[PDB]
Amino acid sequence: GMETLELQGAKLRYHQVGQGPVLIFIPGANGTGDIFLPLAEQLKDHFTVVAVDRRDYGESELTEPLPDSASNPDSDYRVKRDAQDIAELAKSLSDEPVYILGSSSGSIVAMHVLKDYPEVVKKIAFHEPPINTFLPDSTYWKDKNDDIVHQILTEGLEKGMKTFGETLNIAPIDAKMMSQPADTEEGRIEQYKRTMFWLEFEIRQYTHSNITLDDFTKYSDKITLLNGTDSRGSFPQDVNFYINKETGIPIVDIPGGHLGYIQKPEGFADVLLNMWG
């Protein structure tokens, strides 16, 4: 199995092959050390080859969640923590400074290892680095990076959620309220994370989950179906109409739309009290 070095906030997993001075390979965007294993076989007679899964990837595991600020595009948390991981790995395996090669974003990690832990570096190689900060045209490349992230993550989510609302014929008031950006910047990054979590881990799994009509008929006397007065024509109401058609379970109309419990709390409460008070 993969070797483990337990570090602050993570278990760092790495491959180790060969004998001799330590040579650490730092992966780029794939994040994992397995991409260097064919190369390690060629070098194993001359170096103790160490191919790292950086802490956010592969078989490595965080022992606590990323700090909230890591989402900031100018955060230095992850790159410095990756560099410290490499320095601690070097120190755990070798009394002498070590050889280090990084490729792509792994070469940027390697740069920070040299900057902040030069004492661990015997020789270092930067294979095809994509860092732009010191270039004369840094702004052009930084803007392209910022733009592509915004297109994939922000625009992609915004356009998909608008389509979702149209597909389910969500009433305009309800779609507005569900899409409103949070009043607090803290709440805005939390809202992106929550929406993407619901998208990946909830919507498909729950909407196609294992409920049958017979599950409703078995305890039908306990069930009320609720449709909002302000969300007519929407898909969730059609679900209730079908349950009612097939089971006879009654539909009670209640103020507000899809979010009527917050849109019209007094009127929503009055119906609940009629039902159960």
Ligand X SMILES: *[P@@](=O)(CCCCCCCCCCOC(=O)NCCC#C)OCC
Name the site residues for Mg ion (rule: CB under 5 A): 137, 274
Out of 161, 189, 226, 251, the only residue in the binding site for ligand X (CB under 6 A) is 161
User: Is residue 79 within 8 Å of 116, Cβ to Cβ?
Assistant: no
Q: Per rule CB under 6 A, is residue 96 in the interface with ligand X? A: no
Strand partners, 22: 48
Out of 156, 176, 253, 274, the only residue in the binding site for its own copies (CB under 8 A) is 156
Please say which residue, 172 or 219, places its beta carbon nearer to its own copies.
Answer: 219
User: Is residue 104 within 8 Å of 128, Cβ to Cβ?
Assistant: yes
Please say which residue, 14 or 25, places its beta carbon nearer to its own copies.
Answer: 25
Q: Per rule CB under 6 A, is residue 30 in the interface with ligand X? A: yes
User: Is residue 23 within 8 Å of 47, Cβ to Cβ?
Assistant: yes
* CA within 13 Å, CB half, 63: 9
Q: Per rule CB under 6 A, is residue 256 in the interface with ligand X? A: no
Strand partners, 24: 50, 100
- From ligand X, its own copies, Mg ion, none, which one binds at residue 207 (CB under 5 to 8 Å depending on kind)? its own copies
Q: Per rule CB under 8 A, is residue 187 in the interface with its own copies? A: no
Site for its own copies in 190-219 (CB under 8 A): 193-213, 215-216, 218-219
Q: CA dist 211 to 47, 139, 214, 228, 236, Å? A: 59, 54, 8, 23, 15
Site for its own copies in 1-20 (CB under 8 A): none
The 10 Å Cβ neighbour count of residue 271 is: 20
Distance (Å, whole) CA 80 – CA 113:
8
Please work out the total of residues on this chain that contact its own copies, with binding judged by CB under 8 A. 133
Q: Which residues bind ligand X (CB under 6 A)?
A: 28-30, 104-105, 130, 157-158, 161-162, 164-165, 168, 170, 175, 178-179, 195, 258
